[PDB]
RNA sequence: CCUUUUAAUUGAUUAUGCUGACUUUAGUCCCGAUAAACUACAGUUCUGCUUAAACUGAGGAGUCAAGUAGGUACAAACCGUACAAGGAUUAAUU
RNA sequence: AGGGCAUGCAAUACCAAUCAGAUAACAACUGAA
RNA sequence: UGUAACGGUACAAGCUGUAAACAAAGG
RNA sequence: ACCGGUGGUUUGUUAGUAUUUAUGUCAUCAACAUGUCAAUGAAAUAUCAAUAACGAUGAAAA
RNA sequence: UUUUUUUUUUUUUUUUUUUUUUUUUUUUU
RNA sequence: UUUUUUUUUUUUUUUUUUUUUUUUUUUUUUUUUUUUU
RNA sequence: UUUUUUUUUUUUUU
């Protein structure tokens, strides 16, 4: 039996090394989400006259609510006020660290394939399935329409050292 | 992380080197041994190859209790291929209806018509009693006992036996350039039959092809089964696949044959 | 003492202890131990040798003495 | 350490940053002796600290994480951690495919309490990604076999949240579906329950 | 010593060759290298920065013995040892290299010359030597004993080698061919594990072990 | 007696000794002993700039 | 390949004693001097071909050793040993460098960082008396809830644009307080390593795993 | 023990008449060396007798010169 | 040391009293660097 | 404690036992190794389920879950053929990454669809410049296993190899090597280029290792040269060591052929070399387990009731015979299949034509019978027997092999589907036959 | 030198006293069971004991000690020796 | 102090009821330092 | 902080830490 | 008058001084082994010449 | 052929030792 | 009769576990869904 | 006393 014996930790029942495939009841889970939740319950405060903005220029945005947040592009610093000291050039230059969708922009540059097809993904790159998803399900059908509409514009690039080519193209 | 770990091949252990003692240990390690498994355990493990039977044992009842008993035993549990290609369609499907029946009956239980299924059940109870019990035999009769029991030991009876040859040349023509250009046993009754058993044994295809890749030191002179093993055990001319299964109340052996009593057996 | 780092044994190793004692001399894991005895390899932890291309090396281990005397009389011209 | 941890950790992690986080719910290291404002925890006008847009970088992590721990996660810790991920934001639909996936697998192995928490993921304002047709359709398959062949053991409150599920969040159009949970809901032997719940 | 990274830009290992007093094959070189490399690792140091052909690499451990101050006219008493604890590889290159530069030469001591003795002698305290069974030896791509009277080979061999054994039989190392039917040894000619059908019908003895029954 | 380097190494080695209600404070040659040995020596007319002093208060 | 390892050495049995002598003749040790002047390609080069010298040497001590003998001309390692430790001197300064830089213009933005915090420090707790004293008026009203609704209204805003301006700085500043397994001495072995502690994690230490590595 | 540590110099202490010679043993080795040189066909034996500044090419001694009067 | 004695017993250098004497080569009266 | 003297002898007796069994049972274990290696840097980094919904995937979901399958082995056809279904619509959509992961999975799993191949290759055409190594070697290595030849493509492939050489790794160009020579697709200057290239990257840029994969009876006698044969056959001589039987079987195969074809090359090689593969010969080299086809055994049947007395499987030093006569050993016979001929065709394959011109020149009457043509006959066995002894009497084949007329996929599949149902009544009548059905139970 | 002082512990044949050297007993006592031959024309000395086979398709049937005890010039020195894949397909070269 | 500085002394204590270990779900469960 | 082991140095009661007895020249 | 640098006195000419290791025991434990880092000489940057003798340097030697 | 690793079976830690260096955006080629 | 072994793992049986999973090494063979048996 | 693709997990047994 080996002298083992007498000490309070001896054929202990319940341990750490014996139980390595049992989970926690679903009751713990409920209780514990329930209690997370619960924590943020009052009336509201404040004023929200004017609905949020959510939506694109010109376009109004009374009724899609929206439960996401909006990044506003016209209001992020620039490199040279980062870098600047405390008392082209980067006066034009932000690097942003945030969602790409989720930004309030004029214009998006996107890595489509070559085919232009929007089947789940588009190169994969960070940014773009949010943007895709963004995205309606006529941005398809529209792709679709003006592959066909242009054909032959769609198989030529501008000539290398050509601007007037560049603008034309344009 | 002791005093010594070395196993396996590098055992620390010290045993005898002497022969004669060693002579004695394979005796009880193998013919005294124990064995904790009852028949009915032996039988369940194959019941996939004997299916039938072992339907039928847990169907009707009192066989089960039979093969239960202290007393040594001795046991033959035929192959469903066998009972499938030897029964005749008509007898194979009348087999399992009524062995359908009961099982049924007994579903039921467990969940004149009621006078005649009593008839009925009295009736097939007894033929499928008596057809099971017929293979059963008192005593214990292992494989080699009865091989030696044929006469397979003696040398004035081994003669068929021993020397066995065939044509080298047509087998091994570039190994051989110079060609080129028993008895009756008698055992007891079953226990639901009066009638003896007669065992014999045969020679196998294969023996007649050691001399071609063993040394052989003979003097001078003056279908096939595909089953394994030198020697064929016919034991009332159904073969042997397997044998030796020993166990708690006797031994097991499967036959390639049903064996079918006269009182079932037709004009 | 008998047994032990008392008579220039030094300290004690796999050479100098019966069978079962482990210990190394200090190496890189290559994977891991399966339940039955095995030991599975991995190609992955291998390290990997960066050496350039020594085809056409006008350099060589020493400097010519020559060297010398031309380096010194450039900083004269300093002066 | 978001890739070491499990599926029901993670659930509920998701949780927390799901349902109104707030920034004073964080520890104090030597505190002022005076209470903190986590003891009141009410709805405010503004964000302390940061805004909610500082964690996609995270966000972006405990999707990923989900989606490997998704294959080791039992029936009940499965649905909560797919509710969790469109509570959150989880509009990688790389990420939601095998998800989804994985719940048509077990789909058929759960029951009403974990069929519920799972119809909680297509009410409206979530990402459109989890409302698969092909998935809703046997979702509100599924519910109909269960209120059919066990609807004895069903309780008053789930019938309830059944019903404005299976009308707000699923949009179905079932009206023996209908009918048969609002017969079980006042014909059943349920009076007890009912008038307690 | 210092673990190796996995990206080596500037390593610090030294290879050296080890001249070593035992006999060593054609294409085997005895090296001497740290304690904390590995097989892998000394291949490819080899493999990329000589670029030398590498088939097989074996490494041992050598620590040297412990020695005593006893000797000269004020001894101390004290222990020490010479040189220092290593790792003996010995590589398998694909081509051959020279004696002279792997094996040790003396000319005071005439007894010295593992080059010479191949491997005839131990060059330690083995009384018997071992020696598992060879390659030909073995059955798996093993040698035939056969073979040599088969029609496929003897195309190859079309003067410029002679398969048939008869013609390598030592003279001076074997016996004339004996009589069946007088008694003779087995391992005379015989070299194999199984009786000739040549040879006659030979008797069995049993052993009494209780003659006093008869 | 008996020759057993396994009940040497765990009774009397150096993980065993520890573990002892005996006097640290002698000197031991094969031991962990307790007792301070005063360092490295003032410094008299070298180079300022390689004489050592610390370590482990130092490292970075 | 493998030759190299003695050829040309007092090793080599395929050459004269003049020979050997000749061969044997060495220079000066690169200095620091001509060793700053060349780009990373030529000190990469240098370093294993003076690995290459060391290797060769490292035999001839040997053999030496062996015969209880002083090897030729000892100062051709002295020398090897001085160049590689040049080589490696300007490396780690031309490193340290750039750590400098790094370390500085981190201070330059802790700069702005503090006062953004400070400012917006005092707003929040601004803004959480606003919301209180709002509160507590709640069935009531009066000219002074629709002032006190302004004033936090204007807060709030005066607020956001703190964080937007901040939110580039604490990403920037928080940036070493991170491990990278690129700046480890695991995963490379370039001049300028860093080192971490280790951290004690409840979550992980409370859990039975294995010593595996995989 | 070639550390000289053990008690073995004790029984030393006492004077002796003989010891035993392993001749037995030491010609078989010396044969054996022999045999793995005359494969090769080298003489270990004459090398090992020859006289300091003594010349003797191939299998020759005294009696060689016997006969070599001229 | 037996192993049921050694299983109940701590180590030396869990407790402070390795920083309560001065005993060095010196003397017995230690003064630690720096102090 | 203590035991009874009767037990203490079973138990030792028992124990012993143990350790001899023990003893006995790492007899045939000599290959054997505690240590092994296992493949790692191929897998991705990204989680997929083969499971879910093929309309839901992209191509890199595709991929990923093609090879994934492939690897765990869950072959399922109602699982491919929607994945097949799904890559053609997809087919429009393809990085030259993700096409070359599709290839490997299905040459891996042998998934025998040539729909898929068709409408897949026009594609990797088109992108044949922004192919890489890999991709380039699993497109040959899958369309090789799968027997499905290209003349068009394959070329191609092997061009864009040439001209991508210098990116290139030398496995994945050996591969390419080897690949083309067993589809016999390169014309005189392009085997050429290959040798000529070939040979520099063996002597620069290979090992002992990497030197094994290069040796091929079939593209050494067809595609290289005789200074890279040469220089082949002295570096097998000092690589040997570090081989297995699989290697040293292709050797023996590329001596044999090159002494019988190309005497000149022969004698050309050195004494010490010769040696080597004369020696070679001598050893016993080990092979897989073989036995008769069912067509095999159906011919053997019809031939064994004409009345002739033949062997079923047998080997002839270097070469298997799938008949051989024993009143005239002289005679031999050998039994086609759809794999022995070209996808969709009845060409031979270069290894078939190399091993029947081999035998032909040693001196083997050499006899063929093809599956189509006998597959007509259906369950007679006297239209077998007449059509067999037609044979018989006729003048044995050429040296050189010839094929046979044109086919189709259409004709290929109905073929097949033909021959199901004919190897299946077979059976049955075969197995009804054995049942002897005497016993009558009266019951 | 003389004179004053000195807490030097200041005084020896001996406690079978402690630490060392060197005489007498005292060229006394102590020596283990079995050897011999190597020549001036060929050869096999006697005795005690009796597991001395090293591929035959099979790792010689094990453990432990030696903190490396059958390597090396009639060396108690220096210098070497532990390869589980057996590297020499070294059946060739000269 | 320009640069570099393997390994061992069992270390979440620059903090926090006690009682094994990488410092123990309640209870069982105890105490002169 | 104080110490033990291994490696180098001339194998050592010293020095030293694989960069193992030195960078002294940033236009 | 803090704090940095330099110098001197006392402790102390009257007092004392330890760091490395061969050997004992299972362990606790005990213990002052063996002149000096050292030919000698103030100086070896004085030890020359070799064949016996006589010769050289040194206060002194072969 | 052993040792290593699961079980027996034990932080009943064999100082300078290990599948054990911070715990997977790994650039799949 | 003095009343004697079983857990890691192997085989068999029963299944909705999982790249923590078998060479992108190689051979052989008539062959496999839905609108060819 | 576990033997050749790695883990989790249930019954019987020569």
Redesign the interface.
Same mark, same amino acid.
């Given at each position: 039996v080996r002298p083992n014996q007498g000490r309070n930790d001896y054929n202990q029942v319940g341990g750490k090394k014996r139980g390595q495939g049992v989970q926690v009841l679903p009751e713990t889970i409920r209780l514990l989400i329930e209690t997370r939740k619960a924590a943020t319950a009052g009336g509201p405060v404040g004023r929200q006259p004017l609905p949020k903005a959510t939506e694109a220029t010109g376009v109004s945005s009374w009724g899609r609510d929206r439960r996401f947040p909006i990044t506003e592009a016209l209001r992020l610093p620039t490199v040279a006020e980062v870098n600047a000291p405390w008392e082209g050039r980067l006066d034009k230059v932000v690097l942003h660290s945030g969602d790409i969708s989720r930004l309030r922009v004029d214009a998006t540059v996107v890595g489509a394939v070559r085919s232009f097809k929007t089947v789940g993904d588009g190169r994969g790159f960070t940014g773009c399935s949010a943007l895709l998803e963004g995205a309606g399900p006529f941005l398809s059908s529209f792709v679709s329409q003006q592959r066909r509409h242009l054909g032959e514009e769609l198989l030529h690039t501008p000539v290398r050292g050509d601007p007037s080519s560049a603008q034309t193209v344009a | 992380?002791?005093?010594?770990?070395?196993s396996?091949?590098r055992?620390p252990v010290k045993?005898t080197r002497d022969w004669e003692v060693?002579n004695?240990?394979?005796?009880? !390690?193998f013919d005294?041994?124990?064995i904790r498994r009852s028949m009915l355990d032996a039988v369940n493990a194959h019941r996939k190859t004997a299916s039938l039977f072992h339907r039928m044992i847990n169907a009707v009842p009192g066989v089960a209790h039979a093969m239960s008993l202290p007393g040594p035993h001795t046991f033959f549990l035929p192959s469903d291929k066998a009972c499938?290609?030897?029964?005749?369609?008509?007898?194979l499907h009348?087999?399992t209806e009524?062995v359908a029946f009961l099982e049924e009956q007994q579903r039921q239980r467990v969940g004149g018509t009621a006078a005649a299924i009593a008839d009925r059940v009295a009736k097939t109870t007894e033929?499928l009693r008596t057809f099971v019990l017929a293979h059963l035999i008192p005593g214990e009769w292992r494989m080699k006992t009865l091989l030696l029991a044929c006469g397979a030991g003696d040398p004035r009876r081994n003669g068929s036996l021993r020397y066995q040859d065939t044509d080298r040349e047509?087998f091994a023509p570039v190994?051989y350039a110079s060609r080129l250009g028993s008895s009756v046993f008698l055992l007891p009754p079953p226990q639901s039959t009066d009638e003896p058993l007669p065992v014999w044994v045969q020679a196998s295809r294969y023996a007649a092809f050691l001399p071609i890749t063993?040394?052989?030191?003979?003097?001078?002179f003056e279908r096939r089964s595909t089953v394994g093993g030198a020697l064929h055990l016919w034991v009332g001319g159904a073969l042997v696949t397997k044998g030796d299964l020993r166990a708690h109340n006797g031994v097991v052996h499967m036959i390639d044959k049903?064996l079918?009593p006269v009182q079932?057996? !037709?004009s | 003492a008998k047994v032990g780092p008392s008579k220039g044994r030094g300290p004690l190793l796999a050479k100098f202890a019966?069978?079962?004692?482990?210990k190394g001399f200090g190496a890189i894991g290559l994977g891991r131990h399966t339940k039955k005895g095995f030991f599975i390899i991995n190609t992955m932890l291998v390290p990997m040798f960066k050496v350039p291309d020594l085809s056409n090396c006008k350099l060589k281990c020493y400097v010519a003495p020559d060297t010398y005397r031309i380096v010194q009389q450039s900083f004269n011209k300093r002066e | 350490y978001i890739h070491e941890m499990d599926a029901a950790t993670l659930a509920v992690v998701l949780a927390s940053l799901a349902h109104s986080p707030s920034a004073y719910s964080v520890s104090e290291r030597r505190p002022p002796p005076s209470p903190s404002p986590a003891v009141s925890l009410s709805s405010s006008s503004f964000s302390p600290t940061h805004l909610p847009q500082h964690l996609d970088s995270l966000l972006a992590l405990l999707g990923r994480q989900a989606a490997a721990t998704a294959a080791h996660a039992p029936d009940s810790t499965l649905a909560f951690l797919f509710r969790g991920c469109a509570e959150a934001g989880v509009v990688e639909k790389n990420v939601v495919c095998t998800l989804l996936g994985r719940v048509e697998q077990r789909l058929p192995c759960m029951q009403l309490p974990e069929c519920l928490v799972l119809l909680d993921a297509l009410r409206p304002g979530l990402p459109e990604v989890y409302r698969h047709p092909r998935f809703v359709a046997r979702l509100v398959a599924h519910a109909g076999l269960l209120l059919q062949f066990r609807g004895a053991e069903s309780e008053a409150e789930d019938l309830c949240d059944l019903a404005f599920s299976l009308v707000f969040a699923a949009n179905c159009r079932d009206a023996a579906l209908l009918q048969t949970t609002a017969l079980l809901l006042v014909h059943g032997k349920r009076m007890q329950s009912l008038n307690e719940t | 010593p210092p673990k190796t990274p996995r990206n080596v830009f500037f390593p610090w290992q030294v290879f050296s060759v080890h001249r070593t007093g035992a006999f060593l094959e054609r294409r085997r070189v005895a090296l001497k290298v740290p304690v904390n490399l590995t097989k892998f690792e000394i291949q490819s140091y080899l493999e990329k920065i000589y670029g030398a052909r590498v088939l097989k690499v074996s490494t041992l451990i050598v620590v040297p013995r412990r020695r005593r101050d006893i000797f000269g006219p004020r001894p101390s008493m004290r222990y020490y040892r010479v040189g220092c604890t290593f790792k003996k590889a010995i590589v398998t290159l694909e081509d051959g290299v020279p004696d002279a530069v792997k094996m040790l030469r003396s000319s005071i001591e005439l007894a010295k010359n593992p080059d010479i003795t191949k491997h005839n002698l131990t060059y330690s305290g083995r009384v018997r030597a071992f020696k598992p069974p060879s390659a030909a030896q073995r059955w798996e791509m093993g040698e035939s004993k056969?073979a040599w009277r088969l029609p496929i080979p003897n195309l190859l061999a079309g003067d410029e080698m002679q398969l048939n054994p008869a013609l390598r039989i030592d003279e001076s190392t074997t016996q004339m061919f004996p009589d069946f039917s007088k008694p003779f040894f087995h391992n005379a000619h015989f070299n194999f594990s199984?009786?000739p059908?040549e040879v006659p019908?030979?008797q069995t003895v049993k052993l009494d072990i209780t003659p006093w029954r008869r | 007696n008996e020759s057993?380097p396994?009940h040497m190494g765990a009774g009397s080695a150096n993980w065993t000794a520890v573990a002892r209600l005996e006097d640290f404070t002698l000197r031991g040659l094969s031991h962990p002993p307790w007792i301070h040995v005063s360092s490295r020596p003032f410094y008299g007319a070298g180079g300022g700039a390689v004489l050592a002093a610390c370590m482990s208060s130092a490292v970075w | 390949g493998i030759d190299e390892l003695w050829k040309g050495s007092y090793l080599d049995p395929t050459i004269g004693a003049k020979q050997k002598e000749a061969n044997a003749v060495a220079g000066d040790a690169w200095p620091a001097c001509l060793l700053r002047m060349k780009s990373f390609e030529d000190l990469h080069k240098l370093w294993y071909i003076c690995l290459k010298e060391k290797n060769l040497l490292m035999g001839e001590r040997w053999a030496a050793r062996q015969h209880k003998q002083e090897m030729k001309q000892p100062e051709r390692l002295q020398k090897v040993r001085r160049t590689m430790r040049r080589i490696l001197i300007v490396l780690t300064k031309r490193e340290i460098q750039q750590q400098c830089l790094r370390a500085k213009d981190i201070l330059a933005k802790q700069q702005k960082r503090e006062a953004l915090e400070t400012r917006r420090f005092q707003l929040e707790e601004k803004m959480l008396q606003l919301e209180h004293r709002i509160r507590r008026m709640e069935p009531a009203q009066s000219l002074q809830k629709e002032a006190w609704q302004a004033t936090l209204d204007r807060y709030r805003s005066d607020h956001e644009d703190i964080l937007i301006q901040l939110h580039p700085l604490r990403k920037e500043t928080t940036q070493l307080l991170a491990p990278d397994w690129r700046y480890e001495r695991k995963y490379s072995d370039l001049p300028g390593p860093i080192r971490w502690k280790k951290q004690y994690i409840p979550a992980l230490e409370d859990q039975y795993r294995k010593p595996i590595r995989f | 023990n070639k550390v000289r540590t053990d008690k073995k110099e004790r029984k030393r202490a006492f004077p002796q008449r003989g010891f035993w010679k392993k001749q037995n043993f030491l010609q078989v080795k010396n044969n054996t060396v022999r045999l793995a040189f005359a494969v090769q066909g080298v003489d270990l034996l004459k090398l090992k007798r020859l006289r300091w500044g003594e010349v003797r090419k191939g299998n020759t001694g005294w009696w060689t010169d016997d006969y070599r009067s001229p | 040391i037996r192993p049921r004695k050694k299983g109940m017993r701590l180590d030396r250098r869990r407790s402070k009293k390795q920083y309560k004497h001065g005993r060095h080569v010196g003397g017995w009266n230690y003064r630690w660097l720096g102090s | 404690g203590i035991l009874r003297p009767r037990e203490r @002898?079973?138990l030792?007796? @028992?124990k012993?036992?143990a350790?001899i069994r023990? /003893?006995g049972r790492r007899m045939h274990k000599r290959f054997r190794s505690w240590a092994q290696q296992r493949v790692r840097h191929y897998w991705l980094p990204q989680k997929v389920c083969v499971t879910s919904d093929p309309q839901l995937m992209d191509g890199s979901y595709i991929a990923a879950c093609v090879q994934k399958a492939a690897t765990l082995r869950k072959h399922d056809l109602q699982l491919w053929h929607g994945f097949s279904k799904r890559i053609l619509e997809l087919a429009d959509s393809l990085t030259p990454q993700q096409m070359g992961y599709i290839f490997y999975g299905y040459g891996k799993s042998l998934f025998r669809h040539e729909e898929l191949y068709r409408g897949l290759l026009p594609f990797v055409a088109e992108a044949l410049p922004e192919f890489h190594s890999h991709a380039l070697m699993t497109v040959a290595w899958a369309l090789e296993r799968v027997r499905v030849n290209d003349r068009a493509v394959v070329a191609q492939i092997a061009e864009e190899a040439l001209a991508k050489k210098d990116l290139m790794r030398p496995a994945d160009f050996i591969k390419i090597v080897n690949c083309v020579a067993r589809m016999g697709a390169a014309p005189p200057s392009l085997a050429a280029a290959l040798s000529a290239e070939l040979m520099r990257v063996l002597d620069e840029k290979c090992n002992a290792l990497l030197f094994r994969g290069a040796v091929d009876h079939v593209a050494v006698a067809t595609l290289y040269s005789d200074p890279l044969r040469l220089y082949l056959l002295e570096r097998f001589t000092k690589t040997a060591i570090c081989c297995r039987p699989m290697h040293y079987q292709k050797a023996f195969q590329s001596a044999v052929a090159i002494r019988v074809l190309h005497p000149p090359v022969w004698q050309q090689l050195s004494k010490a070399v010769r040696n080597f593969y004369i020696r070679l010969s001598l050893r016993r080299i080990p092979q897989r387990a073989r036995r008769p086809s069912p067509l095999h055994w159906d011919v053997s049947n019809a031939l064994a009731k004409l009345g002739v007395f033949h062997r079923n499987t047998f080997q002839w030093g270097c070469f298997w015979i799938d008949i051989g006569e024993?009143d005239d050993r002289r005679q031999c016979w050998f039994v086609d299949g759809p794999s022995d001929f070209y996808s969709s065709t009845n060409e031979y394959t270069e290894a078939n034509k190399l091993q029947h011109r081999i035998l032909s020149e040693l001196g083997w009457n050499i006899r063929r019978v093809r599956w189509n043509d006998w597959v007509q006959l259906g369950t007679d066995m006297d239209a077998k027997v007449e059509y067999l002894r037609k044979l018989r009497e006729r003048p044995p084949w050429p040296a050189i092999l010839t094929d046979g007329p044109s086919s189709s996929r259409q004709e290929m599949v109905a073929n097949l589907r033909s021959a199901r149902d004919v190897q299946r009544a077979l059976k049955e009548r075969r197995e009804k036959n /054995?049942?002897?059905?005497? @016993?009558?139970?009266? @019951?």
């Open positions: - | 992380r002791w005093w010594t770990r070395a396996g091949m055992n045993w060693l004695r240990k394979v005796y009880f !390690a005294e041994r124990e499938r290609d030897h029964l005749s369609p008509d007898s009348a087999l009524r033929q047509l190994m063993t040394s052989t030191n003979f003097p001078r049903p079918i079932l057996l !037709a | 019966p069978v079962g004692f482990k | - | 056969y199984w009786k059908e019908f030979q | 057993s396994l | - | - | - | @002898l079973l030792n007796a @028992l012993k036992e350790d023990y /003893r024993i /054995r049942q002897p059905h005497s @016993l009558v139970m009266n @019951l």
